[PDB]
Design a protein around this ligand. Structure first.
Ligand SMILES: [Mg+2]
Length: 489
């Protein structure tokens, strides 16, 4: 059914910062982002924080692409999935055919990785036999090893692996290649063909993948820096506190998680672009030419002496974002012509529970009841396992429209209440059940003393239980349980 989801080529009307300064975070997010939901345990938010300072981008192409393919075992039960997300390198310079060409490789790279069936190291080797960075991973369940997740990240992509309590466990950092004086560009998947130097998960774990427009807005952390390689990530203390509004709430949807992170990233993005226009307006108000001031260190002499000491530190923080003498006309014209932001995209993937997927397929495909019946004898160990499983399935929320605006995100339950309550009681009774003809009578005794509503699913149970001519005598006494069903009023 909904086992493969890929984002589409979006084009938005991006206003300027001078018009976005009079808007709150709700107005900025609803005009620039979309939501692509796959289930309660996977969702994607894609948009564009790209904007200009005094003009509007009427055809702002979103050059990012995220995808997901959920894989199943031999019996049709989910046992893994493959996720990939790409960031279009460059583009947005005004050439639309260039933007289409960059998105063409960005979308095809994500789609070709998903449609492959090999491991992550062989899949990449085949497809790398117009640039776009990429970040992908593949998790899958092994018999004695459980979930095994192989990762892969190239460029400005970032991966963060949490557990069920939003506690950080691993991070796959981004990269930058020094190609010149201040020319740090992230490596690309297409560079893998140009160079030979290419340089155990658990249930409920949260794998979050984000683009340069997402984690670049949060508090950063330069992990490593060589002579031409820069490993960068986010401050794990600041990224943890983003989950403080989700500590006690049980089982949140991957959309709600991705919504929290994106809201915080766009909150700092909207404030950083406001601080930049407040700084430029405050510099133009001084008219430094009347006092003949051009050196950046003499401008700091002016601001610190005048009383705008916090306007100076604001300017110093941007100088570090990008002493010696540098003129004013260079930095002002540079800041005026800068583009703020990037295409922002994020995908959150929760590792499922084995029992939750065994029950999910048991509900979706009921004809497989006797096939996967002995599997319940293995997973189910206590009625706390089933109650925990169905409690998680109760709070699951899906999105009817796969792709919809982020403000008009309508969700509803992924299971009907009567479908969950009855299926829980069936599996609960099957566990409470699981020596010749004597036990053949005792099975009819426990079923007789029981008085469960909609007990017609005994035939559904008997299939799981069946897996001289005394079988006939018991099923005869089971047609006596039909009298017990007739007694039910
Ligand atoms: Mg980007």
């Amino acid at each position: 059914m909904r086992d493969k989801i890929i984002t589409g080529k979006k084009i938005i009307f991006s206003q300027s910062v001078a018009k976005d300064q009079t808007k709150n975070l709700s107005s900025f997010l609803s005009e620039r982002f979309y939501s692509v939901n796959q289930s309660h345990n996977h969702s994607i938010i894609i948009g564009s924080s790209l904007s200009h300072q005094e003009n509007d981008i009427e055809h702002d192409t979103i050059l990012d692409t995220s995808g997901v393919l959920v894989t199943t075992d031999t019996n049709g039960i989910v046992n893994g999935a493959r996720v990939a997300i790409t960031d279009g390198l460059g583009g947005g310079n005004g050439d639309q055919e260039e933007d289409d060409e960059i998105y063409r490789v960005s979308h095809s790279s994500c789609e070709n990785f998903l449609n492959c069936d090999q491991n992550i190291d062989t899949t990449l080797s085949l497809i790398t036999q117009t640039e776009a960075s990429m970040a992908a991973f593949i998790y899958q369940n092994h018999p004695g090893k459980g979930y095994i997740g192989e990762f892969a990240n190239i460029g400005d992509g970032l991966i963060i692996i949490l557990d069920k309590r939003f506690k950080i466990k691993h991070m796959v950092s981004a990269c930058h290649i020094y190609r010149g004086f201040g020319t740090w560009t992230p490596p690309s998947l297409q560079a893998l063909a140009t160079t030979a130097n290419k340089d155990k998960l658990a249930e409920g774990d949260i794998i979050i993948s984000m683009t340069d427009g997402v984690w670049g807005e949060l508090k950063t952390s330069l992990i490593a820096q060589t002579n031409d390689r820069r490993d960068i990530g986010v401050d794990k203390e600041y990224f943890k506190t983003l989950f403080d509004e989700l500590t006690d709430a049980p089982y949140p949807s991957s959309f709600d998680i991705a919504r929290i992170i994106t809201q915080r990233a766009m909150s700092r993005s909207l404030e950083r672009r406001k601080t930049l226009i407040k700084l430029i307006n405050e510099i133009e108000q001084q008219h430094f030419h009347e006092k003949s001031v051009k050196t950046i260190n003499e401008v700091l002499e002016y601001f610190i002496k005048t009383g705008h000491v916090e306007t100076a530190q604001t300017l110093k923080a941007i100088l570090f974002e990008d002493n010696i003498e540098i003129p004013l006309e260079m930095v002002m014209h540079d800041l005026k012509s800068r583009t703020v932001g990037d295409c922002s995209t994020i995908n959150v993937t929760r590792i499922p529970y084995h029992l939750d997927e065994l029950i999910r397929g048991f509900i979706n495909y009921p004809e497989k009841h006797q096939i996967l019946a002995p599997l319940f004898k293995a997973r189910v160990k206590s009625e706390a396992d089933l109650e925990e499983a169905f409690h998680r399935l109760s709070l699951e929320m899906v999105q009817p429209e796969i792709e919809c605006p982020i403000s008009e995100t309508h969700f509803e339950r992924a299971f009907k209440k009567e479908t969950l309550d009855k299926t829980q009681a069936v599996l609960t009774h099957y566990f409470r059940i699981s020596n010749y003809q004597e036990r053949l009578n005792d099975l009819s005794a426990y079923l007789s003393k029981e008085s469960s509503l909609e007990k017609n699913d005994i035939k559904l149970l008997l299939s799981m239980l069946d897996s001289n001519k005394l079988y006939k005598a018991f099923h005869k006494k089971i047609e006596l349980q039909l009298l017990d069903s007739e007694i039910e009023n």
